[PDB]
Amino acid sequence: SWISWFCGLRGNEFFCEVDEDYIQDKFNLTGLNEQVPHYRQALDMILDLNPNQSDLIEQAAEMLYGLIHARYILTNRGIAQMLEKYQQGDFGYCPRVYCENQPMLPIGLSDIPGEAMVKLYCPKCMDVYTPKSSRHHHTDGAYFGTGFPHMLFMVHPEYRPKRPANQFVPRLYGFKIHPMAYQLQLQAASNFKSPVKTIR
Template identity: 45%
Template sequence: MEQDLESSNYSESDVSTAYWIEWFLSLKGNEFFCEIDEDYINDRFNLTGISAEVPHYQEAFALMTDNLDAEHDLDNLPENVRMEIETSARHLYGLIHARFIITTRGLVKMFEKLRHAEFGRCPRVLCHNQAVCLVMLYCPRCEDVYAPPSRRHAVVDGAYFGTTFPHLLLQVYPQLMPTKSNDRYIPKIFGFKIHGNALEQRKQDEVREEQRKRILAIPGSEGFPQD
């Protein structure tokens, strides 16, 4: 899902006072992105296959790299076309970002973000504020994923980070891997653990309900006697 331009307070005057990438990274909701090295972006080998996925690729690339010239002048284009090119530039940066962060240099930059908990912390109480990684938000302690608490982060396309990144990062930097915890939440009533028989009874009821639904799904079945 591409970010809504209106939600990022886009204005041409903002872009003109800063480099495009610097401006893009400063937008609210883009805190998870790192800055891609310029030499990586300019190496066309790293961009193989991306042009087919990005409308207005040439203009978007020129805008993203601050290389607009007479050939790629946006001032004379209709407003809707300029907005399409801006959207394509964001999409292009995201696709390149997904490739960059699994390189040695990209992993170093994302390592620093994780080390400073810039992606947030696991909401699970028994993970004790463990810093999370990406793919939604991945907690390496409980090995579960969570939706970002902020809406502006929730709308960022997961393809801009990929599913490989968090696990590769933890392989390259094993010191980030937390000690696994055997702590589990124990349900209690007035401070007392629920007896195992009660839990077993509930499980039996669930199994019986599943069996009842399967029987009722059979044509001509009358179900269980009490149904």
């Protein structure tokens, strides 16, 4: 099948296998015809149903599946499937030290394709991070949505991790840096990087 192969490819670890059950009901695929070119022939390649066109149709099927994915992973079933991957840490671990390697969730900064690549949401610190592995630096963010992880914890509130136990305390010979001292520091950088005279 096409679905199982695509999700099994190198770089597509973040994806879950969308049930054909969901894709055959055309209720769910609304508006997607006006989003991708060659929609009918791209949908055919997904359900397993001339070197000019057959190349472009493969790319349009990749863009279709991904948009469908963004909708699918918001559903209770799509949530449960990602939640399974999340429990095995398929989405990487948080680089923040005081998050203690919290498992992450994929997220898109934008919903429209071509604008941003995929990013990682940490349930603990609640900030977003660029995937550490440079094999994921080509997955379009639009395929996971802006709302996926937020929807997840709304459906399963139980899965929120408690706020970080500890915090980073900068110490210089064990004296803490007073915040008066960054306000200063931040000028000296402004006042510094100033237009050097451009000789006439």
